[PDB]
Symmetry: C3
Subunit: 555 residues, 3 copies
C-alpha cells in the first residue's frame, strides 16, 4: 500500500515535429499570456482594493453688498450672513432671499400664489391645513387687496408664501466667492491616510482644470461655468452643485500615486416641475419679542447647496488576489491544446478527403492529421456479452455484431464494418451443407438451439473455395508442431500427452485463427470462428467423450 502511495502518473504524449502546429501553439500561448498580463496590470487585479473614508472641511471666503427697499436698506453679507455653521460634506451659500419681517400668529389673507385668488366663501374649507399657504383656513373669504381676494388663514402674518424669488438674485456677487476644501481620506485596511493639501502648495492658487488641477480653492462661478452652468440664473431660485473628489490611489511603493481629481456636476434637475420645489431654498425663522408679542422674521433663503462627493479606492499589492487571478487564468493556457487537438480530430475524418480536399486543394496537405489521429488515439469498444467479431475471406474488412442473436444465424446479421489492423510487418517479416454456408465444409452446430445461431457462421459471404483449403490455414491452425511450439513457449515443461494437451491444442488453434484473421487481440478475444474452420480444428484435435463448450464471453 505504501508502494501505492509512492506512485506518480504521467500522461503518454505524442510529440509532433510540425512547424504549423508549433507556430499555432506558441502564438496562442503568447496571445493568452499577453491578454492575461494586460488584464492583470490594467485592472490592478494583483491589488486588494479598499474604499476610502473621507472627512471634508470647507471654508467659504467672500463678501456681498445688497441695496434694496419703504426706505432704502444697504446691507453687507459676510460668511455668517449667507453660510450655515455646517462645514462638512455639504455647505450652503445664500444667493437670494425673501424677507417677511414682524410676523405674528394670527389671521390674515393668504398670499395670492399659483392662482389662489378667492371669489366666494365656497372656494376654501375651514380648518383645512394648507401646507402651501402654511396656515389653517378659517373658511371665510377676505380681501387681500383692493382688486383680488383670498381666504383667511391662521398663520404667521403677513403671510407671503408663494411670492417669487427676487430677479436678479440679490447675492449675485456670490459667484465671486471662493471655497477652500480640505479633504482627509483614509484607507484603514491598508493603514494609509493622506489629504488633498500638501506642503508647498501656493495659497494664492485658484482651481483650474489644466493650470491648477490640484488647487483646492474653488471660485463658485468657475465651478458653474466649468460644466456650462449659469451661476447668475441658478442664483435666483437656487440649486444643488456636487463637487466630486475622486481618489484613484495606488499605494504600492514602486507605483505610489494617491492624488485627488476634482470634477463638478449639477445635482438638482434643471427642469424640475414647478410643483416639485424647483431649485434649492429653505425657510428660516428668526424669533424675537416686540411690543410684548412673540414675533417672527421668516427668511426664504435661496442658494446653492454644494455637496462634496468624495469617493475612490486604494489598491495595494495582495499575494492572495494575485494567486487567485493567476489560478483563474491558468486554464486559458490549454487553448492551444484544445484548438490543435480539435484540428487533428476534425481533419482526420474521411469526410474531408472525399469532399473538402478535391474542392479545396489548399487544405489537401492537411491530410497528415489522419496519421496524427492514429498515433494519438486508440479506439476501443465496450467488451459486452453481445460483442462479436466476424471476418469473411471474401470481404476485406471485419464485421462487428453487437446485437443479440435472437435465433437468426450469425451469418445473416449485418453488423457494422470495422477496419482490419495491420499485422505488424516487423513481426511478419520472418519466413448436405447448411443453407447459410457458402463453402461446402461447414456443419450444423452441436450447441443447444437457443444459442445455435452463434456457430452458424461460414468463412465467406458468397459461394467459393473454403479458407480451410489454403495451405496457410494448415500451417497456422492445423499444424500440430506449431501449436506445440507455442504451448512450450508459454509452458516449457508442458507434457505433450493426454486428453488435456489436445484441448490445449484446440484452444491454441482457435486463438491462432482469430489472431491471423483479426490481428488485434481486442477483436480476436471476441472473434467468432467459422463453422468449417472450427470443425476442422476439432477434427484435428477432437474431444473424446464430451460436448464442446464453444465461444465463451471473456468478460
Amino acid at each position: 500500500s505504501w508502494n501505492d502511495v509512492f506512485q506518480y502518473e504521467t500522461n503518454k504524449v505524442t510529440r509532433i515535429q510540425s512547424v504549423n502546429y508549433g507556430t499555432i501553439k506558441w502564438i496562442l500561448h503568447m496571445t493568452v499570456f499577453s491578454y492575461v498580463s494586460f488584464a492583470l496590470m490594467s485592472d490592478k487585479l494583483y491589488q486588494r482594493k479598499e474604499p476610502l473614508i473621507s472627512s471634508v472641511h470647507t471654508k467659504v471666503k467672500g463678501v456681498a453688498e445688497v441695496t434694496e427697499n419703504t426706505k432704502l436698506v444697504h446691507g453687507i453679507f459676510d460668511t455668517a450672513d449667507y453660510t450655515l455653521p455646517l462645514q462638512g460634506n455639504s455647505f450652503f451659500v445664500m444667493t437670494n432671499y425673501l424677507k417677511s419681517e414682524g410676523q405674528e400668529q394670527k389671521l390674515c389673507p393668504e398670499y395670492p400664489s399659483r392662482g389662489k385668488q378667492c371669489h366666494s366663501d365656497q372656494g376654501c374649507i375651514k380648518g383645512w391645513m394648507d401646507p402651501q399657504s402654511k396656515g389653517i383656513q378659517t373658511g371665510r373669504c377676505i380681501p387681500y387687496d383692493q382688486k383680488r381676494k383670498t381666504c383667511e388663514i391662521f398663520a404667521w402674518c403677513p403671510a407671503e408664501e408663494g411670492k417669487e424669488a427676487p430677479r436678479p438674485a440679490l447675492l449675485r456677487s456670490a459667484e465671486n466667492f471662493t471655497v477652500l476644501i480640505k479633504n482627509n481620506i483614509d484607507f484603514p485596511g491598508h493603514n494609509y491616510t493622506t489629504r488633498n493639501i500638501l506642503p508647498g502648495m501656493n495659497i494664492s492658487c485658484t482651481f483650474h482644470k489644466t493650470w491648477n488641477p490640484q488647487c483646492p480653492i474653488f471660485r463658485l462661478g468657475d465651478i458653474f461655468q466649468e460644466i456650462g452652468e449659469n451661476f447668475t440664473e441658478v442664483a435666483v431660485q437656487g440649486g444643488i452643485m456636487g463637487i466630486e473628489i475622486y481618489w484613484d490611489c495606488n499605494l504600492d511603493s514602486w507605483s505610489h500615486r494617491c492624488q485627488p481629481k476634482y470634477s463638478f456636476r449639477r445635482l438638482d434637475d434643471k427642469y424640475t416641475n414647478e410643483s416639485l420645489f424647483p431649485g434649492y431654498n429653505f425657510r428660516y425663522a428668526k424669533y424675537y419679542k416686540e411690543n410684548g408679542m412673540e414675533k417672527r422674521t421668516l427668511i426664504k433663503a435661496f442658494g446653492v447647496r454644494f455637496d462634496i462627493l468624495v469617493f475612490g479606492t486604494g489598491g495595494k499589492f495582495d499575494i492572495i488576489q494575485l494567486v487567485v487571478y493567476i489560478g483563474s487564468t491558468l486554464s486559458y493556457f490549454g487553448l492551444a491544446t484544445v484548438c490543435i487537438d480539435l484540428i487533428i480530430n476534425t481533419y482526420a475524418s474521411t469526410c474531408c478527403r472525399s469532399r473538402v480536399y478535391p474542392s479545396c486543394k489548399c487544405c489537401e496537405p492537411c491530410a497528415v492529421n489522419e496519421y496524427y489521429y492514429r498515433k494519438k488515439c486508440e479506439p476501443i469498444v465496450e467488451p459486452k456479452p453481445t460483442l462479436k467479431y466476424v471476418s469473411f475471406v471474401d470481404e476485406p474488412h471485419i464485421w462487428m455484431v453487437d446485437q443479440q442473436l435472437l435465433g437468426k444465424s450469425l451469418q445473416d446479421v449485418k453488423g457494422q464494418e470495422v477496419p482490419r489492423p495491420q499485422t505488424d510487418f516487423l513481426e511478419l517479416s520472418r519466413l448436405d451443407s447448411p443453407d447459410w454456408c457458402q463453402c461446402g465444409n461447414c456443419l450444423p452446430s452441436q450447441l443447444p438451439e437457443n444459442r445455435r445461431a452463434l456457430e452458424e457462421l461460414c468463412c465467406r459471404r458468397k459461394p467459393g473455395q473454403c479458407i480451410t483449403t489454403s495451405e496457410l490455414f494448415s500451417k497456422i491452425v492445423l499444424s500440430r508442431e506449431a501449436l506445440q511450439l507455442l504451448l512450450l513457449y508459454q509452458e516449457p515443461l508442458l507434457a505433450l500427452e493426454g486428453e488435456a494437451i489436445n484441448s490445449k491444442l484446440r484452444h491454441c488453434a482457435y486463438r491462432s485463427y482469430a489472431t491471423w484473421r483479426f490481428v488485434s487481440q481486442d477483436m480476436a478475444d471476441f472473434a467468432i470462428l467459422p463453422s468449417c474452420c472450427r470443425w476442422k480444428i476439432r477434427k484435428e484435435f477432437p474431444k473424446t467423450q464430451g460436448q464442446y463448450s464453444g465461444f465463451k464471453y471473456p468478460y
Copy 2:
C-alpha cells in the same frame, strides 16, 4: 533547436465506445455548464459593479396647530417652526417640545428629576458640575417648592431639565406631514447618473408599497405604519427613522433597469435604557436681551430624525470580469474525466471481483473496467540498481527482487510477485549440485563472493526437471543458427568469426532467454538468468581466457 521550438505535444487517448460512460460524461458536462451559466447570469458575474454616490434633497410639507398654556396660547407651526435648515441625507421633524422661557444665568434649585430630591446639605457637593442638572452645585440645599427640596446650582434658571415630555405629543399632526425626497445617484466609473423623479410622475401621488412604489412623496404616518410603528407614541419622546433607497441598477443597454426601491426601518432602539437617552431630542437655545439682561429660551425639541439611507450598485458588462469568471469555472469541466477515471481505477481492482461482485450481481458487468484500465495505464517501476526479476518454471508468474542481496542467495529472497505479460500471439502465431539448486544442472558462481548471491539462482523453486532439458530451450537459446540470424538482422554484414562473435552470441542467448521467460523488455532488461541456463549458454559460447562479467545494471 528551432525544430524543438516547432514541437507540439498531444496526449495519447483511449476512446471508449461505452454508452454509460458517454452518458455520464455528457450529463456531468451539462450539469457543470448549467450551474456555471446560472451563477453567471444570477449574480451578474460578467458585470463590473460600482457603488453609487448619492445626493438627497428633502422638502417637508405640513402645518400643525397647538393649543396649550397661565394663559391660553394658540400657536401655528410651519416648516420653519419644526424643521432645521438641513435638507440632505437627514431631516428632523419636531413632534413635541418642552419650553423654558426667560432663563438667566444665576442660582436656582435643580428640577426634581429621577428622584433628585434633597433632604440635607450632605446630599450634594459644591462645585460639582452636574451634566444631568446642567449646572454647577453650590453645595447648599434649598427648597424647590413647599413639599420637596433640591440643591442650588448655578445654571440657566428656572432650571427644568428632567421634566417629562408632554403626553400626548403636541405636534401629533406631524403624522399627516409629507416629505418629498429627491435622490440623485451617480456611478462615476460607469459614467451614469439618474434621479428618483422622472418626467411624467404624477404630483398628487403619495407613496404606497404596491399602488405607488415609485412615488417619492411619503406621509410620515404611512412610513411608521408600513413597518408597524406607532407615530403617536414615538412622537412623545421622538426617535430615528431610516428611509432606505436601494438602487439595484443594471446599466447594460439590453437589460437597462435603474430604479429605486423604498423601504423603512426604525433606527433607534425602542427599548433603550432610561439612562441612555431614549428616543430623539435636542436642546436648542434662543438667546435674547430683556430688562438689560441676557436671557435664554430653552426648547427641548423631541421629534423624529429621518435618515435617508441611499445605497446600491451599478453593474455594467466588463469583458475582463467575464474572462476571469470563465477561467475560474473552466477547471470544473474536468469533473466528468475525474469521475469516470476514478470509476475505471477503482472497478479494475481485483478486490471487487472477489467480494463485491459475488455479493452484488448488479455491479458485475462493471468488470469491463479492468480492460479499460489495462488499455489506459502502463505500470513501470523505477530501474534502480537493486531491481531484479526472476522466473521459476514451477511458478506461473515472475518475481521482483528490489532489495539488496546481503549475502543471501537470490533464490532464497522472496520479493513481490508480478504478472507475466502475454507474448504477442500475433508475433508468436508463426511456426555436487548447490544446495539452493533444485534441477541438478546449476553450478557455483565464479563471481567474487561479495556479489556471488546474484548468480545463486535456479530455474525452479522445487525439485524437478531442468528447463534446459526442454528442446525449446535449445531452439531459442542454444541454437547457434537462430542467434546468428538475429545478429545478422541487426548487423547484416557482421563477420561470423573470431572470439567476438562468440561473446555476441552469448549476449544474444541471454537476451533471448530473458525475453522468452519475461516477455517484456522492461523485465528482461533486469531479469536474472538461472545458473544452469547461464552456464549451459556459456558452455555453448564460452570465453577463451577471461572471467565473465555477469549481469550489468543497465542504468
Copy 3:
C-alpha cells in the same frame, strides 16, 4: 452518430513506482491544498461581503463655567450653549470663542490683523470686497486707535475679524465632557442589523482601549490622549477629530461575530498653513433689534468637530463565491504534474549524461528519467512529401532527409541522423558503377531526370561489400516463399499466378527491406531503398512491359 455521442476519451498514462516522484507529488499537492485552504479561511473567500449602512446618534453631556470680562461676566455653558442641533455622523463641541456684540452695518476701521496697518490712503482700494476683513473698503485711511491706522470698510462694526483666539481656551473643561455614540448598522443584502449598545452594558462605563473597549461613552480628553493629542492646545484654535467605528462582522451562525472596534484619528492637519485656516472654527451671527436698529452679535466659535467614521463589511457564506474560488484554485493542483514532467523532460536529455553527471555524481542516479521519457513520449515527424529516410549498412543509425532533392543525388544529401528503433526482440526471438555508388551493384535510375536523384542511393556510404550479398537479404527480401507466405497471411486465397502477383511480391519485398532496415513503419513508410537492392528485387520480380513508378508519397 449516436455511437459518437456515446464516446468517452481517457488519457493514456504511465504509472511510475518511484518513491521520489510520489513524495514530490504528494508534498506539492499538500502544499497547494494547505495554501488554498489558508487563503480561503483567512480571507473568508467563501463569504459574500457587503458594506454596511450606518446611522449615528450622538449625545454630549457636560457643563462648563467661564469667567471673563469692562465688567466681570460669569457664564454657564450647557449643551445648548456649545453644541449644534445636529447629532449625526458629526457633532461639534465649542472650546473657545470670540464675541463681538452689538454690530451694526456701517463704516469702521478694519481690525489690524496680519500686519494690516495703514499709513496712507494708497494702501487700500475703494470698493474692494475684502473677504479677510469681511467688509468693502471705502478707499480712505482712518485711525483704528491712537498709534495705528487702518482703512475704512463698510461692514458689521466694530469689526474684529483677525483677532486671536483666547489663550487659554475658555471652554477647556470640555476635555471632561462625555459623548454617548449610538451606532445602528445594517447589511441589507444579508438582511442583518445590529447596534453598538446591547442589553446588559453598564451605564456608568467610560470607554477604554483595554478595560472597556465596548463602552460607547467617550471622554473627549481621553479620545485626544489615546492618540497623543493635547486637548488643551487644540481647544484654542480647534480641530477635527475622527471617531472610527470599524465593523468586521461575520454573519455565519457557526462563527457569528459582529462587534464594533473604536479608534481615534486626528483629521485636521496640525501644521496647516496660517493662511489656510488652521484648526476649526465658524462664525455664527445672532441677530436682534436694539435702539430701532438691526444689530448682530458675531461669535467666532472655535472647537473640535468630532466626525464619527463608521465603516466595515458583513461576510456571509455564499456557495457561488466558494465555487468560484475553488475553480480558480483547481488549476494549481497540476503543479506536481508540471514539475515532475519537467524533471523527466530535462533529465532525459543526453546533455546531462555527458557533462552534469560526471561532474556531479549525486545527480547520476537520475538517469532513469530517460527510461521514463521513452515510456511517456513517442516522437513523430510531419509526413511531408519531402520526408525521406535512408539507412547505410556502414553507419549504425538512419538518416532523415527532409529537404527537396534539387538535382543533387540523395546519397550526397546529409540530412539529420535519427536513432534506430529496437526491432522487437520478442518477435525476433524466433528462428560501370555510378560514381555515387560504393558497392558495385547499383545501377542508374530509370526515372525521369527531374526526379532521378531520389533513386541515386547506395547501400553504404563508403566502399565495401554490398548488403545484397548477405544471405539474410535473400532470406528476407528475395525469398519468394517468404513473400508468398506474407501475401497469403494477408490474403489467404490470393492466386499465386499472373503478372499481378509479381508486382505484389515486388512491393512486399520493398516493405520487407524497409521494415528490416528501419524497423518502425513510420520510417519504413518513407524509407528509400538503395538502387542495388531495388534493382535486385526488380530482377527477381520484374515488370513485363512497364516502367517502375518508384517511391510514392504515402500522404
